[PDB]
Scaffold this active site. Structure first.
Site, PDB file in Angstrom:
ATOM      1  N   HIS A  24      -8.244   0.348   1.889  1.00 54.11           N
ATOM      2  CA  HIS A  24      -8.091  -0.940   2.553  1.00 54.11           C
ATOM      3  C   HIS A  24      -6.699  -1.175   3.127  1.00 54.11           C
ATOM      4  O   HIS A  24      -6.360  -2.321   3.442  1.00 54.11           O
ATOM      5  CB  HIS A  24      -8.472  -2.088   1.605  1.00 54.11           C
ATOM      6  CG  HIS A  24      -7.631  -2.194   0.364  1.00 54.11           C
ATOM      7  ND1 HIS A  24      -7.163  -3.403  -0.108  1.00 54.11           N
ATOM      8  CD2 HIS A  24      -7.226  -1.263  -0.534  1.00 54.11           C
ATOM      9  CE1 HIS A  24      -6.487  -3.210  -1.226  1.00 54.11           C
ATOM     10  NE2 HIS A  24      -6.504  -1.919  -1.504  1.00 54.11           N
TER      11      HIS A  24
ATOM     12  N   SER B 193      -9.312 -12.603  -5.976  1.00 56.18           N
ATOM     13  CA  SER B 193      -9.658 -12.897  -4.593  1.00 56.18           C
ATOM     14  C   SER B 193     -11.108 -13.349  -4.528  1.00 56.18           C
ATOM     15  O   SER B 193     -11.930 -12.973  -5.369  1.00 56.18           O
ATOM     16  CB  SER B 193      -9.449 -11.679  -3.689  1.00 56.18           C
ATOM     17  OG  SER B 193     -10.471 -10.719  -3.893  1.00 56.18           O
TER      18      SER B 193
ATOM     19  N   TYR C 166       0.806  -1.221   0.000  1.00 55.83           N
ATOM     20  CA  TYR C 166       0.000   0.000   0.000  1.00 55.83           C
ATOM     21  C   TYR C 166       0.839   1.271   0.000  1.00 55.83           C
ATOM     22  O   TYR C 166       0.824   2.014  -0.984  1.00 55.83           O
ATOM     23  CB  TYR C 166      -0.942   0.019   1.208  1.00 55.83           C
ATOM     24  CG  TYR C 166      -1.913  -1.120   1.298  1.00 55.83           C
ATOM     25  CD1 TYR C 166      -1.709  -2.158   2.199  1.00 55.83           C
ATOM     26  CD2 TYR C 166      -3.046  -1.151   0.501  1.00 55.83           C
ATOM     27  CE1 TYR C 166      -2.596  -3.204   2.289  1.00 55.83           C
ATOM     28  CE2 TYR C 166      -3.945  -2.199   0.584  1.00 55.83           C
ATOM     29  CZ  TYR C 166      -3.712  -3.222   1.482  1.00 55.83           C
ATOM     30  OH  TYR C 166      -4.591  -4.273   1.583  1.00 55.83           O
TER      31      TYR C 166
ATOM     32  N   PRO D  77     -11.104  -0.734  -3.034  1.00 58.59           N
ATOM     33  CA  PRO D  77     -12.208  -1.576  -3.502  1.00 58.59           C
ATOM     34  C   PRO D  77     -13.565  -0.980  -3.156  1.00 58.59           C
ATOM     35  O   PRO D  77     -13.699  -0.081  -2.323  1.00 58.59           O
ATOM     36  CB  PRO D  77     -11.991  -2.911  -2.781  1.00 58.59           C
ATOM     37  CG  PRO D  77     -11.137  -2.599  -1.610  1.00 58.59           C
ATOM     38  CD  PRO D  77     -10.350  -1.356  -1.927  1.00 58.59           C
TER      39      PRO D  77
HETATM   40  C1  LIG Z   1      -3.784  -7.350  -4.859  1.00 58.11           C
HETATM   41  N1  LIG Z   1      -5.072  -6.996  -4.134  1.00 58.11           N
HETATM   42  C2  LIG Z   1      -5.091  -7.098  -2.822  1.00 58.11           C
HETATM   43  C3  LIG Z   1      -6.230  -6.793  -2.110  1.00 58.11           C
HETATM   44  C4  LIG Z   1      -7.363  -6.377  -2.771  1.00 58.11           C
HETATM   45  C5  LIG Z   1      -8.646  -6.037  -1.951  1.00 58.11           C
HETATM   46  C6  LIG Z   1      -9.397  -7.276  -1.306  1.00 58.11           C
HETATM   47  S1  LIG Z   1      -8.636  -7.849   0.262  1.00 58.11           S
HETATM   48  C7  LIG Z   1      -8.679  -9.667   0.214  1.00 58.11           C
HETATM   49  C8  LIG Z   1     -10.139 -10.104   0.561  1.00 58.11           C
HETATM   50  N2  LIG Z   1     -10.285 -11.554   0.314  1.00 58.11           N
HETATM   51  C9  LIG Z   1      -9.696 -12.511   1.299  1.00 58.11           C
HETATM   52  O1  LIG Z   1      -9.107 -12.083   2.305  1.00 58.11           O
HETATM   53  C10 LIG Z   1      -9.823 -14.024   1.077  1.00 58.11           C
HETATM   54  C11 LIG Z   1      -9.681 -14.915   2.351  1.00 58.11           C
HETATM   55  N3  LIG Z   1     -10.155 -16.291   2.039  1.00 58.11           N
HETATM   56  C12 LIG Z   1      -9.293 -17.442   2.338  1.00 58.11           C
HETATM   57  O2  LIG Z   1      -8.204 -17.285   2.838  1.00 58.11           O
HETATM   58  C13 LIG Z   1      -9.799 -18.857   1.997  1.00 58.11           C
HETATM   59  O3  LIG Z   1      -9.278 -19.727   2.962  1.00 58.11           O
HETATM   60  C14 LIG Z   1      -9.302 -19.337   0.559  1.00 58.11           C
HETATM   61  C15 LIG Z   1      -9.751 -18.293  -0.503  1.00 58.11           C
HETATM   62  C16 LIG Z   1      -7.754 -19.460   0.577  1.00 58.11           C
HETATM   63  C17 LIG Z   1      -9.952 -20.739   0.200  1.00 58.11           C
HETATM   64  O4  LIG Z   1     -11.316 -20.528   0.139  1.00 58.11           O
HETATM   65  P1  LIG Z   1     -12.259 -21.426   1.191  1.00 58.11           P
HETATM   66  O5  LIG Z   1     -13.713 -21.036   1.063  1.00 58.11           O
HETATM   67  O6  LIG Z   1     -11.774 -21.269   2.585  1.00 58.11           O
HETATM   68  O7  LIG Z   1     -12.052 -22.980   0.793  1.00 58.11           O
HETATM   69  P2  LIG Z   1     -13.118 -23.831  -0.049  1.00 58.11           P
HETATM   70  O8  LIG Z   1     -13.552 -23.025  -1.277  1.00 58.11           O
HETATM   71  O9  LIG Z   1     -12.400 -25.093  -0.461  1.00 58.11           O
HETATM   72  O10 LIG Z   1     -14.451 -24.207   0.962  1.00 58.11           O
HETATM   73  C18 LIG Z   1     -15.777 -23.808   0.592  1.00 58.11           C
HETATM   74  C19 LIG Z   1     -16.749 -24.961   0.948  1.00 58.11           C
HETATM   75  O11 LIG Z   1     -16.289 -26.240   0.220  1.00 58.11           O
HETATM   76  C20 LIG Z   1     -15.898 -27.225   1.343  1.00 58.11           C
HETATM   77  N4  LIG Z   1     -14.842 -28.042   0.695  1.00 58.11           N
HETATM   78  C21 LIG Z   1     -13.550 -27.761   0.613  1.00 58.11           C
HETATM   79  N5  LIG Z   1     -12.917 -28.744  -0.042  1.00 58.11           N
HETATM   80  C22 LIG Z   1     -13.836 -29.684  -0.381  1.00 58.11           C
HETATM   81  C23 LIG Z   1     -13.811 -30.916  -1.059  1.00 58.11           C
HETATM   82  N6  LIG Z   1     -12.529 -31.445  -1.582  1.00 58.11           N
HETATM   83  N7  LIG Z   1     -14.940 -31.602  -1.221  1.00 58.11           N
HETATM   84  C24 LIG Z   1     -16.092 -31.133  -0.752  1.00 58.11           C
HETATM   85  N8  LIG Z   1     -16.161 -29.980  -0.112  1.00 58.11           N
HETATM   86  C25 LIG Z   1     -15.061 -29.240   0.089  1.00 58.11           C
HETATM   87  C26 LIG Z   1     -15.674 -26.439   2.425  1.00 58.11           C
HETATM   88  O12 LIG Z   1     -15.927 -27.164   3.587  1.00 58.11           O
HETATM   89  C27 LIG Z   1     -16.707 -25.258   2.253  1.00 58.11           C
HETATM   90  O13 LIG Z   1     -17.968 -25.775   2.703  1.00 58.11           O
HETATM   91  P3  LIG Z   1     -19.204 -24.753   3.060  1.00 58.11           P
HETATM   92  O14 LIG Z   1     -18.716 -23.699   4.023  1.00 58.11           O
HETATM   93  O15 LIG Z   1     -19.719 -24.087   1.766  1.00 58.11           O
HETATM   94  O16 LIG Z   1     -20.343 -25.581   3.721  1.00 58.11           O
HETATM   95  C28 LIG Z   1     -10.886  -6.806  -1.200  1.00 58.11           C
HETATM   96  C29 LIG Z   1     -11.806  -7.286  -2.116  1.00 58.11           C
HETATM   97  C30 LIG Z   1     -13.157  -6.869  -2.050  1.00 58.11           C
HETATM   98  C31 LIG Z   1     -13.552  -5.960  -1.081  1.00 58.11           C
HETATM   99  C32 LIG Z   1     -12.610  -5.442  -0.152  1.00 58.11           C
HETATM  100  C33 LIG Z   1     -13.050  -4.531   0.801  1.00 58.11           C
HETATM  101  C34 LIG Z   1     -12.157  -4.002   1.727  1.00 58.11           C
HETATM  102  C35 LIG Z   1     -10.822  -4.390   1.692  1.00 58.11           C
HETATM  103  C36 LIG Z   1     -10.386  -5.289   0.746  1.00 58.11           C
HETATM  104  C37 LIG Z   1     -11.290  -5.835  -0.201  1.00 58.11           C
HETATM  105  C38 LIG Z   1      -7.313  -6.276  -4.144  1.00 58.11           C
HETATM  106  C39 LIG Z   1      -6.117  -6.604  -4.809  1.00 58.11           C
END
Ligand SMILES: C[n+]1ccc(C[C@@H](SCCNC(=O)CCNC(=O)[C@H](O)C(C)(C)COP(=O)(O)OP(=O)(O)OC[C@H]2O[C@@H](n3cnc4c(N)ncnc43)[C@H](O)[C@@H]2OP(=O)(O)O)c2cccc3ccccc23)cc1
Ligand code: NA
Ligand code: NA
Length: 575
Positions: free
Chosen positions: A305, A508, A74, A87
């Site tokens: 942000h 993201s 930043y 954002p």
């Molecule tokens: C360069 N730059 C930098 C920054 C920016 C601004 C951004 S700032 C970043 C904001 N973003 C984050 O910070 C993301 C944090 N996320 C994580 O870190 C997650 O960990 C991640 C993504 C690693 C993995 O995604 P996940 O969802 O955790 O994993 P999944 O998809 O595998 O799991 C889902 C479901 O599937 C199940 N499942 C898994 N495996 C399975 C299998 N094999 N079979 C069957 N089922 C399975 C699970 O159990 C679950 O089940 P369910 O819950 O649905 O029942 C921003 C954007 C928008 C707005 C903003 C506003 C303010 C400030 C910032 C903002 C832009 C550009």
């Protein structure tokens, strides 16, 4: 009681780094990079010296990367904050028949903000527990305390993150002080509605209109630092900047747009306001949160942000929207504008309009399936979608590129994010098999390549969120080296390293429970920004790119994403 961000072993990071870039550079460039990295990583060499300094840093700091990462992500960035950085979160469509309906929404939203801030100051908020990958683990809460308390000051080369409580209200490019907590004694929704009625009336008086200073905050950071230096020469400008700097948030009462209220145009209004001639100057981009309440029902929040990431932001805004409830005159901030300031405003206006015309943005709703279908294939939805984005990029541009995906390291003290490098060698094998029709790869083998790419994407994802990825580690070693000598080691001057950090595809995942969505601009001139929202039966994509780059196209990329998701569904449906 959270653990400290771990320091990965040096040899692990160096081997992962080389494997990350081998397929993205030529044979000869890689050979040179291999030799450079070997010498950097040799016993008794510079890498090991730097690693030992890094472990000393971990012992003496809460989080050894916080300062380095905040500057590199930043505060060192010189680009204007609109589109390039800040954002936008767009709320659900609202209908404001009359002005008082818009102002009732604003009043209700503000008192929701006040009550949310009281929870934070309670310090009794239960610790967030992770959802998704490695569910159930405790997460840092520090970012919530940067939502309202922060202001980003411009500097010539590096920015700096820095009484009774008040909000700033922006209307017709005029700024008004609206006091809300007046000795731990909050104004009610009814009082706030009454105060907002006065602001709208006063902002409507053209005889009283002041120059649109908020437009200055829309310029390049060094240009705004210079303009601000001019402003602070006069006393009454200093007092006015002080009020904005210490405000809780901004509330912008935007004029109606002229255009159809499509999701894509509502997003454009939150990202840059349509420029100086619409709502672009009804802003103050240095402040962390600008809530927009448009007269036409367009509402959201624009985020500086630097103090928080999107997951924490959306939990706050979903809280606010769910809990929303269905006397002196506010003071207008005064300004004295030099002849020089008048010129700064003309250039800010011209620079801002270039950004407005340059942004190519589309909201695309993939509705053939969502998470439910992907889970039924025994895949992580995020990894599935990441692989689809690599296929989309490759089928359109015929190359894979260094890609960035946000991964939260909130399982560690003060953790923000590390990078999941989605452009893996397994992704490369898969996208080539799909798009090289001369190769005539059988669909059964394409499926095996799809499953292995997902496996690799998930493995990198787990590594990243447990603090064992490479980007933060390498940054820290780089900046530790810089402190010993301005001449960086060869490894970080290597063209391979500089290329590895030009994220032509910057992505993201921000899931929401409601009808809001999130979006941001690309981080390189020839790149895309891609924020997605996977639901059970749909996937929402917000795609940005720059019109000045003839290769990029947000509409074409969105069709490529759709095609890639259909192809991947057909492959999964074979067996
Ligand atoms: C360069 N730059 C930098 C920054 C920016 C601004 C951004 S700032 C970043 C904001 N973003 C984050 O910070 C993301 C944090 N996320 C994580 O870190 C997650 O960990 C991640 C993504 C690693 C993995 O995604 P996940 O969802 O955790 O994993 P999944 O998809 O595998 O799991 C889902 C479901 O599937 C199940 N499942 C898994 N495996 C399975 C299998 N094999 N079979 C069957 N089922 C399975 C699970 O159990 C679950 O089940 P369910 O819950 O649905 O029942 C921003 C954007 C928008 C707005 C903003 C506003 C303010 C400030 C910032 C903002 C832009 C550009
Ligand atoms: Na990183
Ligand atoms: Na383009």
């Amino acid at each position: 009681g959270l653990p400290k961000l771990p320091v990965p072993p040096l040899q692990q990071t160096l081997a992962t780094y080389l494997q990350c870039m081998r397929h993205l550079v030529s044979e000869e460039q890689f050979r040179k990079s291999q030799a450079i990295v070997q010498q950097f990583g040799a016993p008794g060499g510079l890498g090991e010296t730097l690693q030992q300094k890094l472990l000393e840093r971990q012992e003496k700091t809460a989080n050894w990367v916080s300062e380095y990462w905040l500057n590199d992500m930043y505060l060192n960035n010189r680009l204007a904050l609109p589109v390039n950085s800040s954002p936008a979160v767009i709320f659900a469509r609202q209908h404001f028949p009359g002005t008082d309906d818009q102002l009732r929404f604003a009043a209700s939203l503000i008192s929701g903000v006040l009550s949310y801030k009281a929870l934070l100051d309670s310090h009794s908020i239960p610790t967030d527990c992770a959802k998704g990958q490695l569910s159930g683990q405790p997460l840092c809460m520090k970012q919530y305390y940067g939502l309202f308390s922060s202001y980003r000051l411009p500097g010539h080369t590096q920015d700096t993150l820095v009484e009774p409580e008040h909000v700033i209200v922006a209307c017709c490019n005029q700024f008004f002080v609206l006091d809300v907590v007046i000795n731990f004694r909050r104004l009610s929704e009814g009082d706030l509605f009454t105060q907002l009625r006065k602001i709208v009336k006063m902002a409507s008086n053209a005889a009283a209109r002041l120059p649109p200073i908020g437009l200055l905050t829309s310029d390049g950071r060094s240009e705004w630092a210079e303009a601000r230096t001019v402003l602070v020469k006069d006393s009454t400008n200093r007092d006015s900047l002080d009020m904005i700097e210490r405000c809780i948030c901004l509330v912008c009462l935007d004029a109606p747009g002229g255009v159809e209220l499509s999701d894509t145009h509502r997003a454009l209004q939150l990202l840059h306001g349509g420029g100086y001639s619409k709502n672009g100057a009804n802003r103050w981009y240095d402040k962390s949160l600008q809530f927009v309440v448009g007269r036409d029902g367009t509402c959201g929040v624009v985020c500086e942000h630097s103090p928080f990431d999107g997951i924490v932001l959306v939990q706050c805004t979903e809280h606010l929207l769910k809990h929303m409830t269905q006397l002196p005159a506010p003071r207008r901030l005064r300004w004295k504008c030099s002849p020089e300031i008048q010129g700064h405003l003309a250039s800010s206006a011209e620079k801002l309009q270039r950004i407005v015309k340059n942004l190519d943005f589309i909201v695309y709703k993939f509705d053939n399936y969502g998470k439910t279908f992907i889970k039924k294939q025994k895949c992580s939805p995020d990894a599935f979608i990441q692989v689809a984005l690599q296929l989309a990029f490759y089928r359109l541009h015929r190359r894979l590129v260094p890609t960035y995906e946000s991964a939260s390291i909130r399982r560690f003290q003060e953790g923000r994010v590390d990078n999941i490098r989605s452009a893996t060698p397994e992704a490369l094998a898969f996208v080539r098999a799909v798009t090289d029709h001369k190769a005539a790869v059988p669909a059964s083998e394409k499926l095996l390549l799809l499953k292995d790419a997902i496996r690799a994407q998930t493995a990198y994802t787990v590594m990243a969120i447990t603090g064992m990825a490479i980007d933060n580690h390498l940054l820290a070693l780089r900046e530790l080296a810089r402190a010993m000598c301005a001449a960086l080691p060869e490894m970080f001057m290597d063209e391979t390293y500089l290329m590895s950090n030009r994220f032509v595809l910057s992505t993201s995942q921000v899931p929401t429970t409601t009808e809001m969505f999130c979006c941001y601009g690309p981080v390189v001139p020839n790149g895309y920004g891609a924020c997605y929202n996977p639901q059970p039966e749909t996937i929402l994509f917000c795609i940005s790119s720059f019109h000045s780059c003839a290769a990029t196209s947000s509409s074409k990329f969105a069709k490529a994403v759709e095609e890639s998701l259909i192809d991947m569904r057909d492959l999964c449906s074979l067996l």
